[PDB]
Design a protein around this ligand. Structure first.
Ligand SMILES: Cc1cc2cc(n1)-c1cnn(C)c1OCCC[C@@H](C)CN1/C(=N/C2=O)Nc2ccc(CN3CCN(C)CC3)cc21
Ligand SMILES: [Cl-]
Length: 299
């Protein structure tokens, strides 16, 4: 049926690391900044170190499995794991943080060119996950990280599921789920596909085009299903021409097969990125150590 996953899982010694400071803490757990210094290789690699009990070790290992199986410039790659008391996920340090916080903080300095390139890059990442038969199930602006303002990558595979065999849906059970980003069929029937990731892509783009507004702000999660059933959608962001908003609305069709595919999202946003100010109208757009090696260059 499917192909052998010959990915390599790299077990990193704790002595090869230097935790430097806490970057973030919350529901996921704790993320740290640090430096990885492999073996006697004269190299220092900036890394993010993530900790989430046997349940915690199981779930972080499921995440390590997925991240070790992806290799794409717009997906965060696993560097390895450290087998301490609690299992640590070691990944590439993304120095500018999550894109949600980035657009909120740099609102008045984000031009149409960046907004549309980010849409292209996120869609490339998602189309790659689709190539690997991976449904993310948690695409959102908080889960896109900023390597540089010109280069973003999808992260957080804690909900990601590998469609096997010839299966097309992933039928989930209970568990906390981000209601305001999920397709209507996911809310109602807990069915997840690449096309339900497309819906979340549309909410993510809306997050970017509003400079980090909260979807359905004020509405609790339990009415989302009924609001969506009435035909109500997120509103048109002020900077968005009808060309861009129409793309988002198509991501929110009831019929999942009517939504655009990620490879078509790449094409459309890529055409719009060639003439950004024809598609987004933003005020003032036109005026907007020695041995360190980035993980993307340590192969
Ligand atoms: C490959 C990779 C890299 C990284 C994380 C993950 N994966 C990952 C995977 N699953 N999950 C849940 C993950 O964590 C995401 C949640 C926290 C994150 C924003 C922290 N964070 C960070 N994360 C990673 O590098 N880099 C950061 C650089 C700077 C700052 C300072 N703030 C910036 C914005 N404002 C608020 C000022 C303060 C915070 C940073
Ligand atoms: Cl939510």
């Amino acid at each position: 049926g499917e192909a052998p996953n010959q990915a390599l899982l790299r077990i990193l010694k704790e002595t090869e690391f230097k935790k430097i400071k806490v970057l973030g803490s919350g529901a996921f757990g704790t993320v740290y900044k640090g430096l990885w210094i492999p073996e006697g290789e004269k190299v220092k690699i900036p890394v993010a170190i993530k900790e989430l009990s046997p349940k915690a070790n199981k779930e972080i290992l499921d995440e390590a499995y997925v991240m070790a199986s992806v290799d794409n410039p717009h997906v965060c790659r696993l560097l390895g794991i450290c087998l301490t008391s609690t299992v640590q996920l070691i990944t590439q340090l993304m120095p500018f943080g999550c894109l949600l916080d980035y657009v909120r903080e740099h609102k008045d300095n984000i031009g149409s060119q960046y907004l549309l390139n980010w849409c292209v890059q996120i869609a490339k990442g998602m189309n790659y996950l689709e190539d690997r038969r991976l449904v993310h199930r948690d695409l959102a602006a908080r889960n896109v990280l900023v390597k540089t303002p010109q280069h973003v990558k999808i992260t957080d595979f804690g909900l990601a599921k590998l469609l096997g065999a010839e299966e097309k849906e992933y039928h989930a059970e209970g568990g906390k789920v981000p209601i305001k980003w999920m397709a209507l069929e996911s809310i109602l029937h807990r069915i997840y596909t690449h096309q339900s990731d497309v819906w979340s892509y549309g909410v993510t783009v809306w997050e970017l085009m509003t400079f980090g507004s909260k979807p359905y702000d004020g509405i609790p999660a339990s009415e989302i299903s009924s609001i969506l059933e009435k035909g109500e959608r997120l509103p048109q962001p002020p900077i968005c021409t009808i060309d861009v908003y129409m793309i988002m609305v198509k991501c929110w069709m009831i019929d999942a097969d009517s939504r655009p595919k990620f490879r078509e999202l790449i094409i459309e946003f890529s055409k719009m990125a060639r003439d950004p100010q024809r598609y987004l109208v933003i005020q003032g757009d036109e005026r907007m150590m020695d041995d360190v090696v980035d993980a993307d260059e340590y192969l």
